[PDB]
């Protein structure tokens, strides 16, 4: 495909920028443990995937030690390719219609009171995987009546009826991440658009859902553009936002253009609070699902409302 080869050129050029030294404030909070090994056995036992593993998240030992983990539904092959993401690009296997039950069963086994779920893009499917995402939320809630669900979705190309199907499943939080700013958006997430992704949040808000998004900093954006994007998110109706640092998965991935200082993240968090977000969490290794249940509770109690 012409698009894959277009990206190959960019990735080969990415690799001309040598891997960056990480600043000293970027460090791993934990080591392997019984809880990690047990969670990993379960995930493999149930033929599931986690984004924690597939996207190479550095918090995996910290989160899993706390029995917090985020499922990746739809397989481990994505039909899209974003220049920060190390999840495999490929042709997905057949739709596993039994996956929603197994996620739900795993949540029960884990005894989770809040479950976080994301997945890959499924452009191979007629409905782009809308049924899969909805059914996973439904399956979790059926098996786990008092468990909150946070669902981090692709955009389903912004198609209203695909979106409506997902929204109808009624997650406690609907997340969809704009990730970066309009000037460089195409260079980072070419299969999406800034405005389409904002429109997904607005659609979720209009459907009565609490909404969440994320920004990945260090991709070329300025802090002024970050402040504009936070305003855009808020105005679009986004309730909860995470503000985070890009880690480069490999030489073939986008270079790290800057390391945002911990004090700068504090300032971004304050700015977002000031704009009226119900929930804000900022920091270099903050991630969309990171401590999400605790963030949800905080949002659920805020004057802001959500």
């Amino acid at each position: 495909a012409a698009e894959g080869r277009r990206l190959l050129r960019l990735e080969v050029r990415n690799a001309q920028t040598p891997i960056e030294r990480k600043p000293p404030w970027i460090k791993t909070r934990a080591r392997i443990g019984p809880e990690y090994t047990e969670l990993k056995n379960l995930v493999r036992r149930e033929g599931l995937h986690t984004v924690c593993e597939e996207a190479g998240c550095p918090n995996i030992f910290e989160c899993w030690e706390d029995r917090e983990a985020t499922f990746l539904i739809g397989g481990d092959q994505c039909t899209r390719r974003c220049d920060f993401c190390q999840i495999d690009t490929g042709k997905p296997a057949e739709l596993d219609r039994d996956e929603p039950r197994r996620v739900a069963d795993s949540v029960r086994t884990m005894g989770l009171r809040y479950a976080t779920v994301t997945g890959v893009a499924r452009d191979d499917l007629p409905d782009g995987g809308a049924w899969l995402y909805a059914a996973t939320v439904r399956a979790i809630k059926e098996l786990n009546p008092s468990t909150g669900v946070e669902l981090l979705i692709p955009d389903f190309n912004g198609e209203p009826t695909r979106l409506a199907e997902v929204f109808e499943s009624g997650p406690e939080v609907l997340a969809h991440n704009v990730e970066t700013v309009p000037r460089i958006f195409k260079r980072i997430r070419p299969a999406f658009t800034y405005r389409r992704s904002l429109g997904v949040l607005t659609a979720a808000r209009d459907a009565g859902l609490v909404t969440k998004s994320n920004l990945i900093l260090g991709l070329g954006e300025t802090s002024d553009e970050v402040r504009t994007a936070l305003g855009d998110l808020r105005d679009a109706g986004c309730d909860i936002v995470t503000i985070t640092q890009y880690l480069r998965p490999s030489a073939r991935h986008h270079p790290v253009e800057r390391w945002v200082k911990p004090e700068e993240f504090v300032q971004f968090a304050r700015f977002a609070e000031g704009l009226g977000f119900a929930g804000v969490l900022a920091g270099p290794l903050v991630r969309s699902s990171y401590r999400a249940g605790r963030l949800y509770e905080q949002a659920r109690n805020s004057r802001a409302l959500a």
Partner: peptide
């Protein structure tokens, strides 16, 4: 699985 590198 392959975890992104932090400071060395």
């Amino acid at each position: 699985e392959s975890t992104x590198s932090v400071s060395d």
